[PDB]
Write an enzyme that holds these catalytic residues in place. Structure first.
Site: not given
Ligand SMILES: CC(C)(COP(=O)(O)OP(=O)(O)OC[C@H]1O[C@@H](n2cnc3c(N)ncnc32)[C@H](O)[C@@H]1OP(=O)(O)O)[C@@H](O)C(=O)NCCC(=O)NCCS
Ligand SMILES: CC(C)(COP(=O)(O)OP(=O)(O)OC[C@H]1O[C@@H](n2cnc3c(N)ncnc32)[C@H](O)[C@@H]1OP(=O)(O)O)[C@@H](O)C(=O)NCCC(=O)NCCS
Ligand SMILES: CC(C)(COP(=O)(O)OP(=O)(O)OC[C@H]1O[C@@H](n2cnc3c(N)ncnc32)[C@H](O)[C@@H]1OP(=O)(O)O)[C@@H](O)C(=O)NCCC(=O)NCCS
Ligand SMILES: CC(C)(COP(=O)(O)OP(=O)(O)OC[C@H]1O[C@@H](n2cnc3c(N)ncnc32)[C@H](O)[C@@H]1OP(=O)(O)O)[C@@H](O)C(=O)NCCC(=O)NCCS
Lengths: 402, 402, 402, 402
Positions: C85, C93, C95-96, C98, C121-122, C126, C258, C402
């Site tokens: 992901v 940020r 909405g990609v 979502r 990752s963080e 989720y 040891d 994974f």
């Molecule tokens: C995580 C990641 C894919 C987010 O994509 P994004 O398109 O920025 O996420 P969205 O815009 O759809 O965010 C949806 C909601 O999740 C929230 N959120 C909270 N912590 C977040 C975080 N670390 N990353 C993304 N969204 C986060 C967003 O703020 C948003 O909240 P809202 O609806 O209240 O405003 C991106 O930050 C990324 O690529 N990071 C690398 C880590 C990763 O890929 N994940 C590892 C898979 S575990």
């Protein structure tokens, strides 16, 4: 709801509440003598608080200090020094600061101050209220075992080892002479001097009892600190020099501390120190931050009060998103003197009020603010003229923290 | 016992000797291809060496690179880029560098270069040879988890995630456009571009494989590395922005790296970055040091080539303690352009040659040099004018290290 | 206009795009052979991507792996393992994620998976999508110079020093036996075993080549490294033990190293290790974090699939703020066995979907979720019974990351 | 020698001897007022010592405090709190502790205490004497600049900023409410409150003077310290919350401390804190260790006094390798209430006495103790039943250190 109250004067029970809120909001607080020294600088109707819902504790407070600031060219302006600003951690981010600041700045304007000034606990707070970063403090650490003075650097002698407290008047007069010729200089009342020279154990962030080097036209106050291993460092608390001779003589003394590994100081970016050395890298910058912040309350009064180093003829549109202290102004500068009057003519240059404050003591370039879209002009040549005008005669430095 | 000889061209066997000495004197050496790229830039009669007692090896060497430097106002001057300077640790402090530099600069002067330039391994070496610190590099680290962009900062978009080796020509053109607009810019030949983009694991300090962000008007090259713990940080190798829009967009991309704690960069003092943020303190300076040094070889040519920010009419006495490139010059700056003529008239300002070189790209105020007695005038008003004239309208930055 | 696209199958070209985006988004990427092993587990129509405006690269991607997860009681469920992901730092940020997740979960549900699972990752991403933390990984560091085994602790013997790559099938079968008895166990395909036993330098983390201790009923894979300075440390990559005898035997071997100062491992909160020692403090927890996250897609199927530790008869109202996989369910648990049928009847317990996933493998108490208002009931003793039922008879642990 | 004796009372002369040995054996000692407060809880015949050759000093000592502990279900038991245990470093590992412990526990038993309790300086001392780890303390550190509260978490308000020494009775009242509801709760006499609230500099562990947040149903006591870098951190000395609402409100106040980077606390494994956050990882566990240890002196009285989470009908054989407090018992639990009667019947479960004490407040699973052969049964499902019964409905936490 939030309803600030302006305290005509501060009673003892008010100060008790102000000290408690400050200690909680900040996490610590200066000793009682230091608090009392600051309190003595607050004029009438200059304390704004927000009581808790039973009118017991304060959950918000702000006040200002009656001060005098040197600006470029030497003019000394009365300014309001904002201080003791705090909102209870239980009440934060609900608009308490904004409510308090709205009233407080009304009081400041009503009192006639052309500027308000502050130092900031954090960098992201006051821009939105029109405050610009007017001076910069850099932490410099000198390896005195390796540092050597350039063959040309002054070596004027004349430095004495002093018991600081035995020379209150002498030190205060050197500071006063420095103050009058350095933009950022602040009048330092007796109470502050007495507190400094009291040298209370709490007051020590560089460790150990105050030392002082004295020269006819300068002084350096410093402390020595020991490391766990046993390695000694000197932290310069304050170095105030009226002449280049004094500055150099004092630095030669400081770098002559045989059992000291490093000498550090919080200074301004254009400190002559590294230019005095054969190897300027021995004067190591380890940090840089905002120091004095300035909000211009009265644009024409502020702009006419300081002097400039280039001529200019423009119309400025000052944007103020907090109060109505902006608007369009004709700014005409010749002979380094400015005339600044409200006008209806179209603007050549648009500038955020905080940016105007930031440039006010000559500390920044226009091109950084311009990149950020906080200052704008169709004519980039004009912008350069503007920046060149606002440049300083003497590097600015805040006289003391508050 | 020191007699330098000049190599007319550099043979493979010559270079093998040069590489050996360089590695010993420095403690390490760049990869083969890198060396080859620098070697490719050395013109005829541009290498001076001192052999050992049996002419088996070199115990001293120095050479220059045929380069082109952008100066304030946009003129591009040919300059001699001194490099691979080394004296065997067994032969140091016997005047070997002095002897080599004497011959090398004779060659530079005969080839007609108006400036010589270099980067220094240490800060105490080159002042004595007339080189001044002309640009400054500051290490800036941003906590991207806390940094937020100022409401006004440009947000133009347009940034792509690039495989940099697939866009060599596009990147080179962006660099070229930045170069033409920015004092300190250096022409960067294909060989250097190729070597940069080859991204060889040894020349790969501070991270993994290159990443690139690309914009129509700018790019950022960076690497990511891991802490022992497992925390990630990004280090920008190079960020080159033609426009403010591109600079802002690139920083927005870098500060959007979600799993990275901090983004760092070696940048110039006037980088607009902090002005783009709500809290400028989040752009934290952790170090500041000399980057480009400049020796003016031909005072009139250098002074007439650059533009100035203010007008002046003075006589300048330039002190050269290494060669005869100083003397008295009438400097008349009018409409920001200079006429500079050798003269017998008395001087208004005395200035060490290295100081003139250090001021040459607009990077310093006059106060430091003046205090250090390295720049001298009975008229202090005049010195401030002099400093104001030598300021630049665009912040200087060395295009790349050499 | 975010239009996700589902890949019916992944072409080599698509994967090239997926790898580029992942490397930018994460800051780096696993080796090509590791990527291929993961890629081999992706079923049809299990990848959702968002192209850039050019349709050249992807600016967003997500996919799922076809997996099999052991749940309390030993049932093995088909689950979709979300992976790869990423959203480009230039597109975050907006909405990609979502949009991608909305499509991807529609796909997962149409394929019929009762659960989706992931590692994060963080930790703040989720929850809002209905994923609960179902297992916990603690970093434990053992001082093997000081640790001593309890007099009652098994000392079974039977451990051999192995070349792990020579024992793929035997290792695999021990893991399979562990998998069938441990909630959190995942089927581990040959491609993953091969990649693990290849022990490619790129993924070692600074540690050396693998070591393995082998037992009839368990194994430990570990690496050694010696950071500052010369002092050695062992990090256990994986310790899989089918029986208590094997666990104890493997630890006695590890703590027998040891010249090693410390042995560390990422294990689960109820690891028997400290209970094997005379001083439990020598097995030092240094960190604790979420490991496996679970989103229940099909509440009846999920709850009926697992076994329970106490009897219960309640109505659950499961809140799903992302999809419509919640609702009110009659949960009747008898003889540790559940019937879960959707009902119109009023609820005794209200619970967030993520909370239900979090409890699903026995990892938490209800107390924390209840205090946070994420789990709700008027009958507080009923909550405890709910908690008692969802407890496991075997501590849950994720088979592999994974 | 070794010939212990029991002091009927402690004379000032005896106490001086006790403080001398304690300081030596431990390497430091609490202030006089703190010692006095502990001394005040020592009942008759509760101090065991071993004189030096001349009977002018002790080379061994141990005593107990007359205390009251809340167990699961809420019954408060009299317990003997062992403290001031010391053997001269010149007399150690000769069996002096064992000899003293034999007499001391005879006194405890004769006095009628159903439990003895202690906190341990090291983890490997007391298991051999039948003490089990009954509670666990984990150090949690919150990055309050990143932490955010979950949208569902209570936000009750009601928190005041207190001078804790001005609210002794109010704080004590709240603690008493908490301790009656929480297994591990200990009656805290006024002398301990006074000593805590006197906040003597030497007890502050580097931090500054106490802060207190007060709520109707909870309080938090904390201190703030600085680093070399001038960054502030807050350490929670004590957070006592009767209600979920109070707990949330106090943490909201704590995490609202603007100038503090991190807030830390020593809390129990099931603290709701991370469940109140949007990202549970921001509540970082960095350490985990034994806190309260318990030795059951009277198995029937101890087992009948607490309540249980499930029903049970087994025979326990309790192994006591130090005294004779073990044996076979018929443990019958129905409706969460136990009847425990000595019996000749054969046992279904064998359990080391320390294990029984470790399980007594609900802190462990049986799995670990079983794997280590410290708890035994042929019916492995009967063990789980035993473990389920001994679980607690309220997470156990030691009221205060002693
Ligand atoms: C995580 C990641 C894919 C987010 O994509 P994004 O398109 O920025 O996420 P969205 O815009 O759809 O965010 C949806 C909601 O999740 C929230 N959120 C909270 N912590 C977040 C975080 N670390 N990353 C993304 N969204 C986060 C967003 O703020 C948003 O909240 P809202 O609806 O209240 O405003 C991106 O930050 C990324 O690529 N990071 C690398 C880590 C990763 O890929 N994940 C590892 C898979 S575990
Ligand atoms: C700093 C301070 C008083 C803020 O009070 P507050 O009542 O929380 O502030 P407000 O709610 O009025 O906030 C006003 C705006 O400024 C912003 N702001 C406030 N404090 C801020 C900070 N520390 N950093 C960045 N932004 C801040 C708010 O987000 C808000 O922005 P918005 O209008 O876009 O929403 C408070 O946090 C405090 O007491 N902090 C400790 C530091 C201190 O004691 N005072 C400053 C000494 S210079
Ligand atoms: C730097 C370098 C080549 C010096 O060679 P050298 O032959 O010792 O220099 P010289 O003896 O000719 O010294 C000339 C003067 O410069 C000074 N000097 C030389 N190297 C110096 C240094 N690193 N720092 C300060 N001063 C130095 C000498 O003290 C001398 O001063 P003096 O005229 O008052 O006596 C040599 O030290 C070296 O090779 N070191 C490695 C650094 C390097 O690789 N070169 C520079 C990278 S830009
Ligand atoms: C702790 C204490 C009083 C020990 O006295 P001692 O007289 O040395 O103990 P003994 O000789 O009676 O030892 C009894 C048994 O416990 C063991 N033991 C004692 N101290 C131990 C320790 N710190 N760690 C592990 N085992 C220990 C002994 O090895 C011995 O085992 P064995 O019976 O199988 O041989 C002593 O070490 C001391 O004074 N320490 C300073 C702090 C302190 O006392 N702690 C109490 C805080 S709770």
């Amino acid at each position: 709801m939030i309803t600030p109250r302006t305290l005509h004067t501060i009673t003892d029970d008010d100060w008790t509440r102000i000290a408690l809120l400050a200690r909680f909001a900040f996490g610590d607080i200066e000793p009682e003598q230091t608090q009392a020294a600051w309190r003595s600088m607050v004029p009438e109707d200059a304390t704004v608080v927000v009581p808790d819902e039973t009118d017991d504790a304060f959950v918000g407070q702000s006040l200002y200090l009656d001060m005098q600031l040197t600006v470029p060219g030497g003019e000394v302006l009365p300014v309001a020094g904002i201080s003791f600003v705090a909102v209870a951690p239980t009440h934060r981010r609900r608009g308490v600061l904004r409510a308090m600041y709205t009233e407080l700045h009304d009081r400041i304007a009503r009192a006639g101050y052309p500027l308000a000034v502050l130092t900031a606990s954090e960098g992201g707070i006051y821009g939105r209220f029109g405050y610009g970063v007017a001076t910069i403090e850099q932490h410099v650490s000198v390896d005195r075992r390796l540092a050597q003075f350039h063959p040309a650097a002054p070596d004027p002698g004349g430095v004495r080892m002093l018991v600081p407290a035995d020379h209150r008047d002498g030190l205060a007069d050197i500071y006063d002479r420095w103050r009058r010729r350095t933009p950022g200089g602040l009048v330092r009342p007796d109470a502050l001097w007495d507190d400094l020279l009291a040298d209370r154990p709490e007051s020590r962030r560089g460790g150990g009892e105050l030392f002082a080097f004295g020269h006819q036209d300068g002084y350096a106050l410093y402390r020595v600190d020991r490391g766990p291993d046993g390695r000694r460092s000197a932290h310069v608390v304050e170095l105030t020099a009226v002449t280049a001779d004094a500055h150099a003589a004092l630095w030669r003394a400081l770098l002559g501390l045989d059992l000291i590994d490093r000498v550090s100081i919080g200074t301004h970016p254009h400190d002559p120190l590294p230019y005095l050395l054969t190897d300027p890298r021995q004067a190591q910058v380890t940090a840089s931050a905002d120091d004095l912040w300035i909000r211009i309350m009265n644009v024409p009064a502020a702009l006419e009060a300081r002097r400039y180093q280039a001529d200019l003829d423009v119309v400025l549109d000052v944007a103020d998103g907090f109060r109505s202290d902006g608007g369009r102004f004709a700014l005409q500068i010749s002979g380094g003197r400015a005339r600044c009057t409200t006008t209806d003519a179209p603007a050549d240059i648009e500038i955020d009020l905080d940016v105007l404050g930031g440039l006010y003591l000559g500390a920044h370039r226009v091109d950084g603010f311009a990149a950020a879209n906080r200052l704008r002009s169709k004519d980039s040549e004009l912008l350069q003229q503007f920046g060149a005008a606002f440049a300083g005669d003497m590097p600015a430095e805040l006289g003391y923290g508050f």
